[PDB]
Design an enzyme around this catalytic site. Structure first.
Site, PDB file in Angstrom:
ATOM      1  N   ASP A  35     -66.767 -79.747   3.822  1.00 39.52           N
ATOM      2  CA  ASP A  35     -65.975 -79.492   4.975  1.00 39.52           C
ATOM      3  C   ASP A  35     -65.593 -80.882   5.408  1.00 39.52           C
ATOM      4  O   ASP A  35     -66.299 -81.573   5.828  1.00 39.52           O
ATOM      5  CB  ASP A  35     -66.837 -79.151   6.205  1.00 39.52           C
ATOM      6  N   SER A 199     -47.783 -86.302   8.568  1.00 35.86           N
ATOM      7  CA  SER A 199     -46.762 -85.601   7.826  1.00 35.86           C
ATOM      8  C   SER A 199     -45.257 -85.923   8.129  1.00 35.86           C
ATOM      9  O   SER A 199     -45.102 -86.109   9.575  1.00 35.86           O
ATOM     10  CB  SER A 199     -46.931 -84.235   7.874  1.00 35.86           C
TER      11      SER A 199
END
EC number: 3.4.23.22
Length: 330
Positions: A35, A199
């Site tokens: 994770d 992004s």
């Protein structure tokens, strides 16, 4: 040193991925959920409340000659999906894919919430976010990657998750045969303890690319892609009959649909998520309403590039002095 381990979807929907991990002496092999959005390595154990164990493999520290109780140390974690676990702490030897850390904090669960009990395939979590998020008290502990880092050939790990198929986590090296083209690297902020990056935009299907900064985290422990409501609405507007359902808990679409791809920007590069990756199947057995793999982050408080996004790429988690993230197509 290096390590290389295969990671395998737990079910037909790629809800999560498990990777075998050797703990203790002699080895006890547990299948853990790696994770990148948390920083605790915790396991089902011989100390876990019996009614809360349902099929998991447990770590039994008393059977490991290298286990030592970390006296006074406790841990307690809550995850974004509302699940939780807590317990005490041992140090022991932990190996992933041939890479060994001695003295690793292994957090033994005394209690786990329902969702963990109900998932018989996940024996614990191995956190790979920054150690500043680790929950052990009163002495915070380091992640497996942090402990391994100095010994690695290169201070990196990579995630190569499969779509309905096995993939690979590598530590200490970049497998140049595992991706196509070049890797594009992008800046990381560690301020919140995550692999947080920005992004450069998105496209829906064959649509034009929208340049827009989307700050989010690269999180292998989250199944879906969670993005701003504007972005998600623009995606689902291209699917006939799709709608956001309050009763179901997100966007649903007719199971008869063909989903468009979704592209996200990494610098000047583009990663394309095929439409099939965004199908999470019937909301309930036999239903003709299907659950979408792109959902709104509104009210999470953060955008999350989870497995839906990451499995479309070869992803480099660069833990150099100045950390960065790299993405390549594959």
């Amino acid at each position: 040193s290096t390590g290389s381990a295969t990671t395998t979807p737990i079910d037909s929907l790629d809800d999560a991925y498990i990777t075998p991990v050797q703990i203790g002496t002699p080895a006890q092999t547990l299948n853990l959920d790696f994770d990148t959005g948390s920083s605790d390595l915790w396991v089902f154990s011989s100390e876990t409340t019996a009614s809360e164990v349902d099929g998991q493999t447990i770590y039994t520290p008393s059977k490991s000659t290298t286990a030592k109780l970390l006296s006074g140390a406790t841990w307690s974690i809550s995850y974004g999906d509302g699940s939780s676990s807590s317990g005490d702490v041992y140090t022991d030897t932990v190996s992933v894919g041939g890479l060994t850390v001695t003295g690793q904090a292994v957090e033994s669960a005394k209690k786990v919430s329902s969702s963990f009990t109900e998932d018989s395939t996940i024996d614990g979590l191995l956190g790979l976010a920054f150690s500043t998020l680790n929950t052990v008290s009163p002495t915070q502990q380091k992640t497996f990657f942090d402990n391994a880092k100095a010994s690695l050939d290169s201070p990196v790990f990579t995630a190569d998750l499969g779509y309905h198929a096995p993939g690979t986590y590598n530590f200490g090296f970049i497998d140049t045969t595992a991706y196509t083209g070049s890797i594009t690297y992008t800046a990381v902020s560690t301020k919140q303890g995550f692999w947080e990056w920005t992004s450069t935009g998105y496209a829906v299907g064959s649509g034009t690319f929208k340049s827009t900064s989307i700050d989010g985290i690269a999180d292998t422990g989250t199944t879906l892609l969670y993005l701003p409501a504007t972005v998600v609405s623009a995606y689902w507007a291209q699917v006939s009959g799709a709608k956001s359902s309050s009763s179901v808990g997100g966007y649903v679409f007719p199971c008869s649909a063909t989903l468009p791809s979704f592209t996200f920007g990494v610098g000047s590069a583009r990663i394309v998520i095929p439409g099939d990756y965004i199908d999470f199947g019937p909301i309930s057995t036999g239903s003709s309403s299907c659950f979408g793999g792109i959902q709104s982050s509104a009210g999470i408080g953060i955008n999350i590039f989870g497995d839906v996004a990451l499995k479309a790429a070869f992803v480099v988690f660069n833990g150099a002095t100045t950390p960065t993230l790299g993405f390549a197509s594959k």
